[PDB]
Amino acid sequence: KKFIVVCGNITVDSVTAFLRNFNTEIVFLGETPTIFKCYLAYTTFISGSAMKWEDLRRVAVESAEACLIIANPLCSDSHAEDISNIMRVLSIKNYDSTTRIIIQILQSHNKVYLPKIPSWNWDTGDNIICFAELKLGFIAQGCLVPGLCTFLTSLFVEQNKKVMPKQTWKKHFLNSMKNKILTQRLSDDFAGMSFPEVARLCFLKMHLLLIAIEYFCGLILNPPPQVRIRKNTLGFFIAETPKDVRRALFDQLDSSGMFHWCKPTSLDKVTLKRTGYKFRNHIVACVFGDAHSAPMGLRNFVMPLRASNYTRKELKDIVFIGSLDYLQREWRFLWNFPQIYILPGCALYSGDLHAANIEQCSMCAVLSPPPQPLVDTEAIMATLTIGSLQIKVPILTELKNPSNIHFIEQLGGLEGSLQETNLHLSTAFSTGTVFSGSFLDSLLATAFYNYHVLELLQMLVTGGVSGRNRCKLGLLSLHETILSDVNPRNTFGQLFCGSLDLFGILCVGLYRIIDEENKRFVITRPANEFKLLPSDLVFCAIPFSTAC
Amino acid sequence: KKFIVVCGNITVDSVTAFLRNFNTEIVFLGETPTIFKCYLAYTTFISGSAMKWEDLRRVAVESAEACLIIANPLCSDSHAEDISNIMRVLSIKNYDSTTRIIIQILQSHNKVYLPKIPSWNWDTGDNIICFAELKLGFIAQGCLVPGLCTFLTSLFVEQNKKVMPKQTWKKHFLNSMKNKILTQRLSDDFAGMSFPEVARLCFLKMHLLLIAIEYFCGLILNPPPQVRIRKNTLGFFIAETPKDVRRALFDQLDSSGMFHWCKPTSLDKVTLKRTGYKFRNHIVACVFGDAHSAPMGLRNFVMPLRASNYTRKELKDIVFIGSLDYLQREWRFLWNFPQIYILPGCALYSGDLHAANIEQCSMCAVLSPPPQPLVDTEAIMATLTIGSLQIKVPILTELKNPSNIHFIEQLGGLEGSLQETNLHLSTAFSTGTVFSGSFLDSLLATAFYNYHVLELLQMLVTGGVSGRNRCKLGLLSLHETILSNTFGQLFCGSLDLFGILCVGLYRIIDEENKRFVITRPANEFKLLPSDLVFCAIPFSTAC
């Protein structure tokens, strides 16, 4: 009865990249013509074009629950692929303008067009995914707030829960990973209550950590007092299973005011000279490329580090180390961001790392290059030279293939038996010195089944989708910080409550030292009654302009 | 029982390039799959990947004596090959971190990473070879000290000893080549003796010329008085056979203080203008390339000519003549060396040679370009135009294929019968106007069987591996020099008076004043007044 159509690809990978990553029947459509015949009881296929009207009727899109548009047969021109796919959205909508569409855009700035189609509207369910935009987002956040990256990831990662842990601290880490982001609409008897009033009851009565809500037209993280809940309001939670969540059913900016802006200055000024100095508490991003390399959307990485709810005062400088020839091709889209600088060179060269004052930086991001026809070698070689420096430097390495974790740990020092084949079980992931977007492959199915989850994810990771006034996610010390005035700081739940109903700060996770170099690990949503240490730091939603 | 594994190549050449260049069993491993089946009684093969853990157990590296990593299937990207191979070293060490590893790096600056691996340590035997680094080293030394290049080579060359010589002087040259660098640990009754004290006894009692030692943590050439020998100390000698050596068992620098340094100045300043002058006693290096040419590690050639134990005063200017497009690609790695200059042009053009004041230079190095898919023609054509100049210019030509010697001698003047098919027998080699790294092919086996030999070679050739204070190798006159009857007589005085370790002669050929290299002559070897002498001059000596 119910089915979905798939468009614009014949990639053996994509079929599994979808089918494995995906009750509801599937049907394909595309240019190439039937080797993968094993998986062909749970699906159907067609050889046509999405443009041709006859072919769309042939598959009967009208009654299809939704229609996905898949991209990147490692296209020659990324730009052309999107234009091409955006062309399909027109063709498809022209057929049955009420059909739900989920299009993959390869490079973010090409999303802009999709709304400009009249036939398209968000409310019926139409949606766009950009992995480039999200994979770079997670990393960004990790550069803003130590650990925040892995925190965010664990809400979407799903441990298989077979691994019996050795040590107490690793026992904590894994069971915290059980936390997801479930969605649920709130009871009627809530109506009229202020957010913090509601947040409390769910936490205390139901042991549910609720963190944002929708009206569905407007999503907001940790609403202030003035905003009251309405009837039929959708809430955003953090919890193990959906059963548990169901219990709760009973200064200079841009035009849009979303990020700091400036008059588009040319690269010549921004490009650092190497012949003939100092930076402090800044972010070094290493990128790899050349004239022949595909573009990585660097906009997506600056933008979150340039949100409007930060302040010119507290913004960080961003030095890119890389091929100027590669980086000048991105510059068009990085024009209007401030305090961005480019050092031409290579991160593998420790001389060029010192030129960028990598010793006095705040975080070093090692950005994998995008794919071409030896997969993470570069990222591993950087982490080698950086990690072993005559100066440990803060670091965040991206892996395209997470199985390569055992190489990074090897460089750390821990021997083969103590090395993990699985990134998520790794100690390097729990600290947050690595990241791997592999898990976002399932995302296309997620945005189908519950797109609100994507909505939230999008804004946490990217910092936008009133304006300047919004909650950051931040890490707080408990020592010489405002929290240190809470009367009972003895237990997480105790801390959570005071902080909220005193300062409107929504405590959401901890960052605990490992006690067995002062490396800490991420605990998402601990038990209400969770013994807290004085050394702990705390992940939390800090509202804009708070003294701290 | 004992065996070694080989990695990262399926090159018919490499199999012979190793097998011919190599008691101990061999086993291969690589991507391509069995034509070379004749050589297959003394070896074994596999078709796998060194990365995959299953494949490493399959070959059983744990019990392997050591594991070599071979490079350069004339790769498209040289950089990528090393990164790739360095990736194997990780994979392999991850398996059995105690396994001995011998990796070939294609371009020197990529060695840096290998130590940064924790699992890797030198003491268990782990080691890296860089032919580019060594082949350019020998040449460098030849530019520092006339003849030094061939001297150094003969210690590693092995004559086949079939050639009955015509003339007295050629009789000397060939039998001096018998000298190798053997290694041996010293007797216990030596402990506490100062180096020069020890050097003496070995020379006089045993007729063994000893030249450096290790403790094994620290290698030193011609140690001063203050350094005494310890028990279980390893010595470095010069001698025919290991039996003989067994008898002895009974100013502005860089960060590391190894070479002169300076703030990285851009190419625009350093690049000589051709339109619109003078250099003196300088080194002209001719290089060949283009956008399409593979890189030759020019760092390796400057670095030794820029050692810290020389002094800003006595450093030589280095003019490169070549394609700017080619040379600007190397410039990143030559930044921090001083008195380096680049004349864009071609060495085949005698106009561009005169622009570089080649007439008033001290030595002209003709550097062969690295290999691509007519092998030494360029090197030969340069040597033609240089050697025939309206001005003979000092010259040192590199040959990738030594059989091409007979062309160079032809240009000299000597006719076909007097021409030699074999470079080492040639008169041009004994004078030191040519060089050929062909002999370093065996080096991978050498670094296996005795790596200390490589250690020494590395520092003699490259000038490094306390800091600023070390012995050069130098040529001294005997007339208006501090040295002013028999080699052994000269050897002893010079040492026990000035701490100068005399190691070889440079004798005129008497039958144009061209001289030939005599390594470690007999103790009682009649010396001429005209002779010059190779020797280890300690730093800051008056002379």
UniProtKB/Swiss-Prot annotation, chain A:
Disease in which the protein is involved: Spermatogenic failure 79: An autosomal recessive, male infertility disorder characterized by asthenoteratozoospermia with acrosome hypoplasia, disruption of the mitochondrial sheath, and reduced progressive sperm motility. The disorder is due to an abnormal acrosome reaction and impaired membrane potential after capacitation.
Domain notes: The S4 segment, which is characterized by a series of positively charged amino acids at every third position, is part of the voltage-sensor. The pore-forming domain (also referred as P region) is imbedded into the membrane, and forms the selectivity filter of the pore. It contains the signature sequence of potassium channels that displays selectivity to potassium.
Subcellular location, principal: membrane
Cytoplasm among keywords: no
Origin species: Homo sapiens (Human)
Family affiliation: Belongs to the potassium channel family. Calcium-activated (TC 1.A.1.3) subfamily. KCa5.1/KCNU1 sub-subfamily.
Cytoplasmic domain ranges by topology: 1-548
UniProt entry tagged with the keyword Ion transport: yes
Expressing tissues: Testis-specific.
Gene coding for it: KCNU1
Domain RCK N-terminal residue range list: 1-129, 280-418
Function, in words: Testis-specific potassium channel activated by both intracellular pH and membrane voltage that mediates export of K(+). Represents the primary spermatozoan K(+) current. The channel underlies a pH-triggered membrane hyperpolarization during the process of sperm capacitation, as sperm encounter the alkaline environment near the ovum in the female reproductive tract, thereby playing an essential for male fertility.
Domain of life: Eukaryota
GO molecular function terms attached to this record: potassium channel activity
Region of the whole protein represented: 331 to 1043 of 1149
Compartment annotation: Cell membrane; Cell projection, Cilium, Flagellum membrane
Keywords: Cell membrane, Cell projection, Cilium, Disease variant, Flagellum, Ion channel, Ion transport, Membrane, Potassium, Potassium channel, Potassium transport, Transmembrane, Transmembrane helix, Transport, Voltage-gated channel
GO terms for biological process, alphabetical: potassium ion transmembrane transport; reproductive process
Protein name: Potassium channel subfamily U member 1
One cellular component term from this protein's GO annotations in UniProt: membrane
The protein's assembly and partners: Homotetramer; which constitutes the activated potassium channel. Interacts with LRRC52; this interaction changes channel gating properties, such as shifting gating to more negative potentials at a given pH.
From Swiss-Prot, chain B:
Tissue spec. comment: Testis-specific.
Cell location: Cell membrane; Cell projection, Cilium, Flagellum membrane
Domain RCK N-terminal: 1-129, 280-418
Residues included from the entire protein: 331 to 1043 of 1149
Residue ranges, Cytoplasmic side: 1-543
Gene assigned in the entry: KCNU1
Domain comment in the entry: The S4 segment, which is characterized by a series of positively charged amino acids at every third position, is part of the voltage-sensor. The pore-forming domain (also referred as P region) is imbedded into the membrane, and forms the selectivity filter of the pore. It contains the signature sequence of potassium channels that displays selectivity to potassium.
Domain of life: Eukaryota
Name of the protein in question: Potassium channel subfamily U member 1
Quaternary organization: Homotetramer; which constitutes the activated potassium channel. Interacts with LRRC52; this interaction changes channel gating properties, such as shifting gating to more negative potentials at a given pH.
Outcome recorded upon mutating I69F: In SPGF79; severely decreased protein abundance in patient sperm
Disease in which the protein is involved: Spermatogenic failure 79: An autosomal recessive, male infertility disorder characterized by asthenoteratozoospermia with acrosome hypoplasia, disruption of the mitochondrial sheath, and reduced progressive sperm motility. The disorder is due to an abnormal acrosome reaction and impaired membrane potential after capacitation.
Mutagenesis or variant effect for H282R: In SPGF79; no protein detected in patient sperm; a knockin mouse model recapitulates the phenotype of male infertility
Described purpose of this protein according to its UniProt entry: Testis-specific potassium channel activated by both intracellular pH and membrane voltage that mediates export of K(+). Represents the primary spermatozoan K(+) current. The channel underlies a pH-triggered membrane hyperpolarization during the process of sperm capacitation, as sperm encounter the alkaline environment near the ovum in the female reproductive tract, thereby playing an essential for male fertility.
Family: Belongs to the potassium channel family. Calcium-activated (TC 1.A.1.3) subfamily. KCa5.1/KCNU1 sub-subfamily.
